[PDB]
Amino acid sequence: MEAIPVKQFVKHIGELYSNNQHGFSEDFEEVQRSTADMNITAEHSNHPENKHKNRYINILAYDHSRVKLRPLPSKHSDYINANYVDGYNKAKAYIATQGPLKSTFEDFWRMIWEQNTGIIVMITNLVEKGRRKCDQYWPTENTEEYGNIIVTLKSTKIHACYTVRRFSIRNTKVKQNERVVIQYHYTQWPDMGVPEYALPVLTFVRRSSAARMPETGPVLVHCSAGVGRTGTYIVIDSMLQQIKDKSTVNVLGFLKHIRTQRNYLVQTEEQYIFIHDALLEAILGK
Fold this sequence. Notes:
monomer, alpha/beta, Protein-Tyrosine Phosphatase, Chain A, 12 strands, 35% helix, globular
């Protein structure tokens, strides 16, 4: 922890990059260790009934911060591999989740209804380098039913790096109640590592963040596992909010805190450096 003044931040990034990124390695190692003396339970994730609801076996949802689905008229119908994550000066500003599976499409859309979510942030392509990363939980055109949630694609705007899909959603068992759900899908994340330039992601962050309507549920952020790119997005968005309000940046302290809310948020040192680049672009661009 301990906030860095924004005017001293780019100088700090210079120091972190020097000597083959020694500073960045030290920071990321401290993030990885911040769990060491902590046992964070994820019993529901490990329950045999819930195992098929997990995309990855080692990517669990911590019990304390996990999003609970309202129970259905069995005991384990409450489970989704999703966790609430804080934003800047706002608890539960996000729902960081995995890329839904065909078997969890109903659970996913029910969570969006129950949580009053109005924005989806998707930072993965369905398939990357021939590998299945996420199943298509939304309709290619027109309408698709996911249990009691009927989803209608109303408009699409395909930018160079990201696609904006405007959906209309309704619950069959609500006396027909309609809600607008906007999906911000980043389409240009490379197969390996992080993007070369931070600016396109910064722009994706700014525009997806600006669409947050008061006073709706948390912003749903997902990639494949719901940790790396998801965590990268959360830190960039929160640190921009921090800059705007206090003119300070605290990547390290904030990341160590959100790491108690969902395992592995910001999975690699490369993502950790990328966060810094996005913020550098925001500071110098100002």
